[model samples]
Target: SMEDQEENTLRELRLFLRDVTKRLATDKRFNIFSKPVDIEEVSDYLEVIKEPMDLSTVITKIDKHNYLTAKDFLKDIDLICSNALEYNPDKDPGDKIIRHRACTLKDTAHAIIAAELDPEFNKLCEEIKEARIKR
Candidate 1:
């Protein structure tokens, strides 16, 4: 049950970041979040060469800058989680201990997202709550 909850919470956080990325892309004030590269503006040499490029090459060229801010927040959460595990014991801790440690990061990550983006935060909370009720 704890693992299930952890997975669900992590999923919710990831979805929240994705939603924010999409929302910020079209918003004028948040345009900085989406810095998609203009393929047409590539060097004239590439256009003249007309070299065939695969899907992976094209994907690599596209700048997915929308998630940059969200990524930094996720990294911060990672640092927090890692810091929580700095001190180690002689023996391996059971899953219960690991899960307990993770719960703090989960809670803190939710709070950080809530503080940064209340609208999206509420959306995530509501979605999770609704799903729980249906279950």
Candidate 2:
């Protein structure tokens, strides 16, 4: 029943992420961060962004069981947002759209996760986060 418990927790987490991802990938506002940036056009994208994360990739990760915890899932979620904020300054008119919308999606994800209610699911999430804090 050990793996079953983890599985249940993962299932709930996946549901949360699926809901979160629908907006991230499907919505017009967040489609910009839905995939990797184009290095060819940006020229220095790979240089400035050492790591790339996106909505499509994270969903792939979910099916592959690449995420072991809610926090793991969120790191990828946050990565896309952080990457955009770092890559595009709001000072530039066009790039600001990327950064601005990225923040919106980031906040939405936080609100969704925070608002969900389930005893075992939330307990595991807290355990994962608490145990990972020192490391």
Candidate 3:
């Protein structure tokens, strides 16, 4: 059941990111496409996209559920960051494949976060079966 849920969640997440990556690629937001992303790189990318002047303060507010601007999304960017760190896309345990998977995962997560900035995410979220991801 866990595997099935992960698969479904990953599938839905992938679809959402496909649209997100398309928009980001077109809008050229924060120059996110400059290189494949990694845990270290997400911080820089998120900062540029969200434009936070005081990262610490923004992070605190975000954790407190105060308010998060598009820029403030970087506060929780770690969620997506860890995804990259955990991926081994080569279907093997090596650096390159792991990094590749990480970046792909990061891209997917980025698109989801970007959707939060705009309202299109509600539609995508509807397509996701919470019974699976919530399991």
Candidate 4:
């Protein structure tokens, strides 16, 4: 049952991610999170955030099939949000602006996941933990 459930979850997860990536790309509200951070525009950006991520690249990974599990795919999106805040550590106007965007970004991600995939995603994660503990 676990294997069967996991199979279904991964299939839907891939499909959902495809739509999620395309949806974010079209959303103007997510414009900031849509593309890679500009290096020259923000000095030491590369130096600060080690593992960079953006919507476009995430789509590329989906197309290239770089993800296998829920954690693998989920972290990429979360990383984008945190990367912004980490770079804008000042928490000033710039941080607030980015923090808002990042907030909405995470809120949307969680809400969307909850809306459609949370049932299966969470079950799969729980199943995995149980299996690991059993092992």
lDDT of each: 0.43, 0.77, 0.43, 0.76
Candidate 3 per-residue C-alpha lDDT over 1-135 given as tens digits, one digit per residue, 9 for 90 to 100: 765654554454445444444443344332333244544845554543332222233334444533323332433344344534443235555646546544554565456676554454434434343443454
Candidate 3, pairs of clashing residues = 50-71, 84-102
Identify the runs in model 1 with alpha carbons over 4 angstroms from their true place.
Answer: 29-35, 44-114, 117-135
Q: How close is every model to the real structure, measured as TM-score? A: 0.30, 0.81, 0.27, 0.75
Candidate 4, 12-128: lDDT as tens digits: 667878897777778787898898888888778889889999999998887675665555667888998899888886847977888788878877876776677666566665566
Model 4 misplacement above 4 A: 1-12, 118-135
* Span of 10 residues, lowest total lDDT, candidate 3: 50-59
True-vs-predicted CA distance for residue 105, candidate 2, Å? 1.1
Instruction: Tell me the lDDT of model 1 at 56.
Output: 26
| Model 4 root mean square deviation, Cα atoms | 3.8
State the weakest 10-residue window (summed lDDT) of model 2.
126-135
Model 2 gets an lDDT of: 0.77
Best TM-score goes to which candidate?
A: 2
